[PDB]
């Protein structure tokens, strides 16, 4: 199944006063922001080439809290600042989606444009009908996958299914974590989706040539002090503090080899290991994965290496490591 490795995602947060209601254990808005910080960090950790943008909608107006960027810390700071937001007004799906569409219209065709609307207040007061905007969204192939809160909104249901996204409603906080963690992963590319080669640039960390001879002093490029060494660009030739980042001049993505390598596990998903409770002639008391005695009647095995893994080993392998230790051999 074709997958879009590079995706520009907009997490549309609503500053409705329905968010004031403390349905969850803490305030709803505070919980959403606290978990969305984790979502942002994990999304960047699972898709370095991708970038994210936050639009906060309240009082019938949508404001770009943070533009598209490759730096998780800046977005995290924006979330922490927004934690104290007043949270009064009424959202406008038309306004939010129009802002997202305006920013995403000029984005490259190859990248997957995606929107995740964390809908809290079921109402949607908009200057213009949203069914018309749905047509433009379908034309622009911008995937929109709403996540409703305490409501199965019909307009958002049709939005999701027509635009190709998925609709969900929060059963509880634990299920909210699961929903956002699921949305972290790249979505499969459908027939409407198209792939195209994208120019990429690989910089190399550089320092003073020899005892600060013919040095290359520079401060930064988006109170930066002088830097003896740092990253550079093949074309900008402008010092960059951290990678990966889009060029401020070229418009070309600067990214190192490990960042790309971080996404190969998506292309290579791990086949689920059959769960057999009984020992099944497994005379090895120690679990091969962790070399620990199997204290539970559960075993996992591959179709190639035919090794033995306990519950923790299998869960960790399929969750984070994304590869079978013994089966690597």
């Amino acid at each position: 199944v074709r997958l879009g490795m590079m995706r520009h995602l907009y997490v549309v947060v609503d500053g409705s006063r329905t968010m004031e209601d403390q349905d969850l254990k803490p305030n709803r808005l505070t919980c959403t922001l606290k978990l969305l910080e984790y979502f942002v960090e994990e999304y960047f950790d699972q898709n370095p080439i991708s970038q994210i943008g936050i639009i906060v909608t309240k009082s019938k107006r949508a404001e770009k809290l943070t533009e598209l960027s490759g730096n998780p810390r800046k977005h995290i700071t924006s979330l922490k600042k927004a934690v104290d937001m007043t949270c009064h007004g009424e959202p406008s799906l038309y306004n939010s989606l129009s802002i997202a569409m305006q920013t995403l219209k000029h984005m490259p065709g190859h990248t997957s444009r995606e929107v995740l609307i964390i809908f809290s207040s079921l109402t949607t007061c908009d200057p213009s009908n949203i069914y018309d905007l749905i047509k433009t969204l379908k034309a622009a192939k911008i995937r929109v996958s709403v996540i409703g809160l305490s409501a199965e909104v019909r307009v958002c249901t049709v939005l999701a299914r027509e635009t190709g996204g998925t609709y969900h409603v929060i059963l509880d906080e634990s299920h909210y974590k699961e929903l956002l963690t699921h949305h972290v992963s790249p979505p499969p590319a459908s027939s409407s989706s198209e792939c195209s080669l994208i120019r990429m640039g690989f910089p190399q960390h550089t320092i003073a040539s020899l005892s600060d001879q013919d040095a290359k002093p520079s401060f930064s490029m988006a109170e930066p002090g002088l830097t003896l060494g740092g990253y550079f660009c093949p074309q900008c030739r402008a010092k960059y503090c951290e990678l990966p980042v889009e060029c401020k001049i070229c418009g070309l993505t600067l990214v190192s080899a490990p960042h790309l390598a971080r996404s190969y596990h998506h292309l290579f998903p791990l086949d689920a290991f059959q769960e057999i409770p009984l020992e099944e002639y497994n005379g090895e008391r120690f679990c091969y994965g962790c070399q620990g005695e199997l204290k539970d009647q559960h075993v996992y095995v591959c179709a190639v290496c035919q090794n033995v893994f306990c519950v923790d080993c299998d869960v960790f392998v399929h969750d984070s490591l994304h590869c079978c230790p013994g089966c690597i051999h």
Binding site: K216, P217, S218, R237, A238
Partner: peptide
């Protein structure tokens, strides 16, 4: 002192 040559490279 403290030559500024990075600008020249651009």
């Amino acid at each position: 002192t403290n030559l500024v040559s990075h600008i020249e490279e651009m």
